[PDB]
Write a protein that binds this DNA or RNA. Structure first.
Lengths: 272, 90, 44
RNA sequence: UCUACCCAUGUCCAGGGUGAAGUUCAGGUAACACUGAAUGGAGGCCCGAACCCACGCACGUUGAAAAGUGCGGGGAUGAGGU
RNA sequence: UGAGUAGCGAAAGAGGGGUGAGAAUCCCCUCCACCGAAUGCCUAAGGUUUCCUGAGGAAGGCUCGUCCGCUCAGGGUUAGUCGGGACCUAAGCCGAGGCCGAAAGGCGUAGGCGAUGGACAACAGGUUGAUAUUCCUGUACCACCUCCUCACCAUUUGAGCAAUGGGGGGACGCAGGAGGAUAGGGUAAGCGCGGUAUUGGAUAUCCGCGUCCAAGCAGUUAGGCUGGGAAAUAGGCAAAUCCGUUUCCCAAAGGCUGAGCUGUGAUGGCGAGCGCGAAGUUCCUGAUUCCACACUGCCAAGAAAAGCCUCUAGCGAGGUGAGAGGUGCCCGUACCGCAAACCGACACAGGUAGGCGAGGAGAGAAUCCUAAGGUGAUCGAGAGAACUCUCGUUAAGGAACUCGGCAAAAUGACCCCGUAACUUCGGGAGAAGGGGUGCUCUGUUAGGGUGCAAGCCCGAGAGAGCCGCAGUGAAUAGGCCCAGGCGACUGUUUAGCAAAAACACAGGUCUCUGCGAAGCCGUAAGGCGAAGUAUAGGGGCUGACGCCUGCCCGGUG
């Protein structure tokens, strides 16, 4: 699923890209595009709050249904499309009643297969169930915290979650990175592995490709000046003589946990 | 408003004398007056029929005398093309 | 050798025009003190 | 209104080379590789105008000019210039 | 004071006439010269009368000045179709309600503003001193209205009308390559007009000039784009004939769009040339333009909305269509705009967005000289010293000079031949480095394009000869090689002393964060992150690739 360019120029020396055999078409469907202008890392008052961002190729948003609301209608899918929003490629599925909708394409999905969405759906890849009907030990994705909100938790390419068990009002599912969490039983997740698994195997060769992607370059703090960063200054190349390394805003940035220790959510994380 | 005020004074140049031969007439009109009420004014008060009206306005020329640097009046000049076999004007 | 002043009437009246100064409170103080001073061209 | 960066929307890049990946054909093998022709046209590709930049030298230094000119230079389909 | 000194701001004029009180500087004429992908022609931003005419020369003009971008007195800009408004919306801005905040205020919904975008109907001739798709001329087109005209429908089993509601559209990137057409170009042929010269020669395959016409209307077309029909209907907040979706049947028809081209517009205009006015065709070449973002491929995956069409809800008793007659507002319109009117304090060797942008040779907008066209650029003449600067040559030696081949010199085009170590097999590599290039004839060469031909265009080569010291005879287009650091590379940076080994970079690694993520801005509402979800974000460090990355947790964190 990954092809490597033979090195003709010097930019393309280590230069692999993802071919699009999984992708079945090129034109996006008209009624579901959404306008989307890049903010360029600027706040509502215009100040820059996120570094290293802004200035990519222009993109058009595609509204995609994380909610999986419509229940019981047999949905067929005839496409697989590349979305230039998030790593995964997303698939338009068209319903029996005559309305078309967009879905994250899961692993091993193909054209023409059927999709069910109810709380009585059989568990096949791409289906949607509330967690109470999901059997234990099944790989699942697109989970949400609040019911009716729409899937939030596992959406990136090749990412997965397997249900460790139900125990009542709450269900134990193991998210990605393994830090298991204890969540409502009434939320609707989508069955399977997300269908762009090989995405880490991309090798950006050119810096211009990341510039197309929309990544501004990142400067080290050690080559800063004294005022604008705690590391900067010192002639020659100096090691960071500031005990633990700290961020541009003074917070140390090497392994101290940063979450509000008095939050509400921490009574669900602590299974681990 | 009153039609007897909408056009102020005619202007007598060599160009104007040329156009009265071929039956177009020159007038200086009010600044707020536009292409049409000058037309309705002129057939209301002249008994003439006018085919086409052209309008253009001049801004004041800068002009110097003594040590003061004043500005002359902004003007709006109107051209009225009478129809065939329409009456003439003084 | 592009010099420090390129003229643009639209940007000039947008950033220094009378409506632009009256839109703010601080601009109103600017108008008031200029008028107390007695400037002929009172706003840009 | 200079300049740095960013947002939306336009515009510009005379010309000549190189020849990728695929595709077809010929062999090749049970098949798969593979081998050769044609095709194909990719490149933060090459050479080089407009355009942009400013590497060297000379002059200029009460200058044509409060930062330039002349002779050469670099990029020149891109992280492009405007 | 310097001192009558420096300077008088890139440039080829010269001569005769004329004005004048005064003439290198003003005007007229003849030659010469300069630019000509511009120093030509339009037109932005901007300036605001600098534009034209007639007077004047105190100041401005680096001199003069009879002169003008100066002064004075007049005069000059005409639009239903061009540009912008009464059309739409992006970024952004404002913002009733509201939400926050010691006060001022900040944020923001509905909504509105906001072109650099989308849509949107006139053109080619003439005209003066100044304007011209605006004025005159002829042919048009768009929107709207009805004192009128004819044709048709139904005036509730209703003709007609259609929405601030759905649906389609508008609706889109980049690169490359055919093809089709037209600009444009050659004067090749033919045609017309004028001429045949005095310097040796030339009524002759001789010389100079010209050899065209829209928009609209009717057809046609290179083409591109499209399957069509029927039934049913968990949808598109309400409806469905519209759209969407399944099932059944036919597969090419048909439809959409379409550069251009034919007639007409044209019994008219333009047209070399002395108010009049001839010929006004064919051939070849032929795009940087159009078909057209049409196709193909590519991945970084490529605006909104209203114009426009459709559907019902709805309105509905008079309308629809064609004539005939009428209506059609505001603002801009001069002049300059690579310049002496703009920005640089100046009539400043600088900068200044877009459209067109010819010929010879040429791959070309390079290069040199010219066309159309514009200009001789505002101090001069006259000696031809030192010295400074920009250039051109130098015998012999050739890098000795010099910190350093700095500078300068040398190679340079096209076609053949040939081309190494290393290599990440792409490269290195135009490696190096050789050889040929002019003209004439064999030849309107093989051969090819174009056309039925006639003719026109392109020209691989060889073979005989002719000259020059020299044949890409000028202008302009790599010096090269061998090693070694440093940095993988293209890139970026101290405007105005430092472009580098500095920064970035792809890659790597560590670390935080389970989504009202973390982090950041703000007190806060609000945001960014992100209309994203550990294959994702944030931070630190190192810097392609290859081989590796040892020991110490006593101290600090």
């Amino acid at each position: 699923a990954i092809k490597k360019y033979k090195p003709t120029s010097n930019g393309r020396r280590g230069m692999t890209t993802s071919d699009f055999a999984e992708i079945t078409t090129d034109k996006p469907e008209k009624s579901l595009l959404a306008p989307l202008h890049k903010k360029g890392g600027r706040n509502n008052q215009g100040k820059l709050t996120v570094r290293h961002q802004g200035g990519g190729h222009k993109r058009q948003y595609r509204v995609i249904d994380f909610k999986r609301d419509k229940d019981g209608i047999p949905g067929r899918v005839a496409t697989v499309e590349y979305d230039p929003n998030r790593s995964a490629n997303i698939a338009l599925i068209n319903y029996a009643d005559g309305e078309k909708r967009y879905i994250l394409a899961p692993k091993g999905i193909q054209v023409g297969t059927e999709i069910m969405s109810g709380p009585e759906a059989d568990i096949k890849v791409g289906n949607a169930l509330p967690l109470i009907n999901i059997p234990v030990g099944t790989v699942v994705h697109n989970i949400e915290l609040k019911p009716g909100k729409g899937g939030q938790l596992v959406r990136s390419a090749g990412t997965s979650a397997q249900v460790l068990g139900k125990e009542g009002k709450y269900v134990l599912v193991r998210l990605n990175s393994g830090e298991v969490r204890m969540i409502l039983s009434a939320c609707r997740a989508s069955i399977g592995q997300v269908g762009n698994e090989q995405h880490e195997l991309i090798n950006i060769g050119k810096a211009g490709r990341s510039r197309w992607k929309g990544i501004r370059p990142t400067v080290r703090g050690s080559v800063m000046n004294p005022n604008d960063h705690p590391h900067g200054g010192g002639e020659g190349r100096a090691p960071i003589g500031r005990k633990s390394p700290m961020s541009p805003w003074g917070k140390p940035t090497l392994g101290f946990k940063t979450r509000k220790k008095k939050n509400k959510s921490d009574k669900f994380i602590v299974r681990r | 408003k009153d039609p007897r005020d909408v056009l102020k004074r005619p202007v007598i140049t060599e160009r104007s004398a040329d156009l009265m031969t071929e039956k177009k007439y020159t007038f200086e009109v009010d600044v707020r007056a536009n292409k049409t009420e000058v037309k309705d004014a002129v057939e209301s008060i002249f008994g003439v029929k006018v085919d086409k009206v052209n309008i253009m306005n001049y801004k004041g020329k800068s002009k110097r005398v003594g040590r003061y640097t004043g500005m002359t009046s902004r003007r709006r000049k109107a051209i009225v093309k009478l129809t065939a076999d329409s009456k003439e004007i003084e | 050798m592009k010099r420090t002043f390129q003229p643009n009437n639209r940007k000039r009246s947008k950033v220094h025009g009378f409506r632009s100064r009256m839109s703010s409170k601080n601009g109103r103080l600017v108008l008031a003190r200029r008028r107390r001073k007695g400037r002929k061209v009172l706003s840009a």
